[PDB]
Symmetry: C3
Subunit: 142 residues, 3 copies
């Protein structure tokens, strides 16, 4: 019955210094057409999708005078190997006790069959996949 | 309202040192079979749910001691199994300055009838209620 | 526009530093199925459960003080009662220290994401508003948006 194309994938903990999504964990979804290919979610159908993502950024101190953390959801159309941002957010973590920066991305978008979605970051060397629930990427057809 | 199991509860400002969810004053829902019991959302039927919650912490200055501020949503399927973190994020107020730190969690989960969803912070003494819509917890069957 | 459901996804219009003005334009924009954009608000055409959401991005150059505050607020202007009532609100604070005088000024950035579900009446008006539009980052698509969908 729960037959709408859907995905809720999480970061792999054993994958050191990389944001690589997996259909693993007690509560992860890759269902009703959606695929995880080349670290990307493949859209099986045309329609309105709710898409979202969260990354937890962590670090011990502030090494450089200034560092910028970004979180992006981009779209690649089937014959168009050139990604295009749908959601994007930026945080400056600083202007030695640890810091934390969760970044939530969320929106409703018109998607086409075969579109690839990536949830990317610039600083995987600051990712914190240290616990369940902290790093996720999901989509649902509406 | 409609046909689908739906909830949008908010923190009770009269609740001393406890995050207390209530269905109170309109612009809040709790309908189509969803119950609020023992501070937790109880789901009535199998299905894919969008699940989301927000908390806002704040302080007048930075605590003499380093504090981690967390927020998490957990699936409680049965008394004998340990709750599973669906959505979790950490914040740290400090590396007399007023500070505000929102945590937003939101994801799509397959659930079963009777599942209990809890939305819980580690530290209640840093919750902010100074405005109306800063602390909320909700779900909708999709 | 594949589904018949009321749907919006409007973005910020950058034209002069000033205001957070919503516009139905860009490669990601949507205004369908009765939903209207009027007096800088989303107008709802029917009764139903709507997922409402927005993201704003603030940016500044260094910290004039320690009490710069950044607010974002989705409000409901109901046909039943016509005054802005908060549905979703959050506050951020970019500045832990003042940037000392003559010190290289550093760029800061703070996102706020608001998202939640609400029963809306036909003719209800929704706004997504900030306190410091002088701190709004703009410009690029995918950073500052406001959206709704009938579930």
């Amino acid at each position: 019955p729960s037959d709408m194309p859907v995905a809720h994938v999480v970061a792999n903990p054993q994958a050191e210094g990389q944001l690589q999504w997996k259909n693993a964990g007690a509560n992860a979804l890759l269902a009703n057409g959606v695929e995880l290919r080349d670290n990307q979610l493949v859209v099986p159908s045309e329609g309105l999708y709710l898409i979202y993502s969260q990354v937890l950024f962590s670090g011990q101190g502030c090494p450089s005078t200034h560092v910028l953390l970004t979180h992006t959801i981009s779209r690649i159309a089937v014959s168009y190997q050139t990604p295009v941002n749908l959601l994007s957010a930026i945080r400056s973590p600083c202007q030695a006790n640890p810091w934390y920066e969760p970044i939530y991305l969320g929106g409703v978008f018109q998607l086409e069959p075969g579109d690839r979605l990536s949830a990317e970051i610039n600083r995987p060397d600051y990712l914190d996949f240290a616990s369940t629930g902290q790093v996720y990427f999901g989509i649902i057809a509406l």
